[PDB]
Amino acid sequence: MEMEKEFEQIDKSGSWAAIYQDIRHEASDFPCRVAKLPKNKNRNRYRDVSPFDHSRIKLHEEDNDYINASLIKMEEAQRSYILTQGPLPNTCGHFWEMVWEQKSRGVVMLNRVMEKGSLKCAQYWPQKEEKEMIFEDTNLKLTLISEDIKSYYTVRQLELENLTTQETREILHFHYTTWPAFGVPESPASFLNFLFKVRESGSLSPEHGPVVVHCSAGIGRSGTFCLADTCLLLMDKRKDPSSVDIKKVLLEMRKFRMGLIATADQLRFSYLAVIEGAKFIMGDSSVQDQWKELSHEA
């Protein structure tokens, strides 16, 4: 309600750009010394997107423990996320090492491998059952088990094997294929339909490690996804939509990784998604079916 009131006031004042810039100005600035070491230059996709030292994920290797990935630990909401860049051709083994070591069950990919004529992410998972991937540097094997292809997203079941111990784990890969870089989803319905698909899988459950979320830089689309999820979880705990301060939650998230939410319209969309999702949180379970229809997933 208060969230809806502010939305209307910002929309009427046409002040989303000013609100968004205020977030950028107030956001945390912490050191990223490890990310900027010369030996790690080729492990970073973007010069101006780096993990803070205090929240970076460490690989459990003695050689070089660096990956461009951050642990977003939301204490009040009691949920954690790992946000990371789209893997590079030389960091795909590191990426799956992180998934293994952090005990994650789900990977959420919000970008395509090719966007706007450029390569934004390595092809880090297998596309055919019979052509598995072996990451020799990290001693992992990855096999495609099945895939459920919808109109604007695909869910894949993967098997990740630790070749050292022969232990295997099911990984669920949620690929949103129609969300443009520096853009927004087609509608709140299409976004929420996808988010609750991830939730229903158990990939966000506290009995698993943190879900891994990435786009190309791991801040814009990735930040929008986690902001909406965290706001809806906070609302769920109290059944109180007016108790959720979206800008305060975003500033809290930005303590753990820089640059979350990359445009003013992504911030506006985050409000829209949370305002619409509140319908389900506050007890209208039928709205989930409506989102599925409006998403045209079939």
Numbering used by the authors: 1 to 298
Quote the authors verbatim:
Protein Tyrosine Phosphatase 1B (PTP1B) is the prototypical protein tyrosine phosphatase and plays an essential role in the regulation of several kinase-driven signalling pathways. Here we identify PTP1B as an inhibitor of IL-6 and show that, in vitro, it can dephosphorylate all four members of the JAK family. Dephosphorylation of substrate is initiated by nucleophilic attack by the active-site cysteine (Cys215) to form a phosphoenzyme intermediate followed by hydrolysis of the cysteinyl-phosphate to release free phosphate. Asp181 acts as both a proton donor, enabling protonation of the tyrosyl leaving group, and as a proton acceptor, receiving a proton from the water molecule that hydrolyzes the phosphoenzyme intermediate.
Interestingly, the D181A/Q262A mutant exists in two states in the apo-form. The majority of the apo-protein has a Tm of 70 °C (similar to the substrate bound form of the triple mutant), whilst the minor species has a Tm of 55 °C. Titration of substrate leads to a progressive increase in the Tm of the minor species until it all exists in the Tm = 70 °C state. To better understand the interesting thermal shift profile of the D181A/Q262A double mutant, we solved its crystal structure in both apo- and substrate-bound forms. The apo structure was similar to the apo structure of wild-type PTP1B (PDB: 2CM226) with the one notable exception that the WPD loop (which closes over the top of a substrate tyrosine) was already in its closed position. Although the WPD loop is usually closed when a substrate is bound, it is noteworthy that the previously determined PTP1B Q262A structure (PDB 1A5Y25) also shows the loop in the closed state. It is possible that a preference for being in the closed position, even in apo form, explains the hyper-stable apo-species seen in the thermal shift profile of the D181A/Q262A double mutant. The reason for the extremely slow off-rate compared to C215A alone is unclear, however we note that incorporation of the D181A/Q262A mutations seem to stabilise the WPD-loop in a closed conformation, in which F182 may restrict exit of the tyrosine from the active site. This preference for the closed conformation can be seen in the structure of the Q262A mutant alone. Likewise, the WPD-loop open conformation is stabilised by an interaction between Arg112 and Asp181 (PDB 2CM226), an interaction that is also not possible in the double or triple mutant.
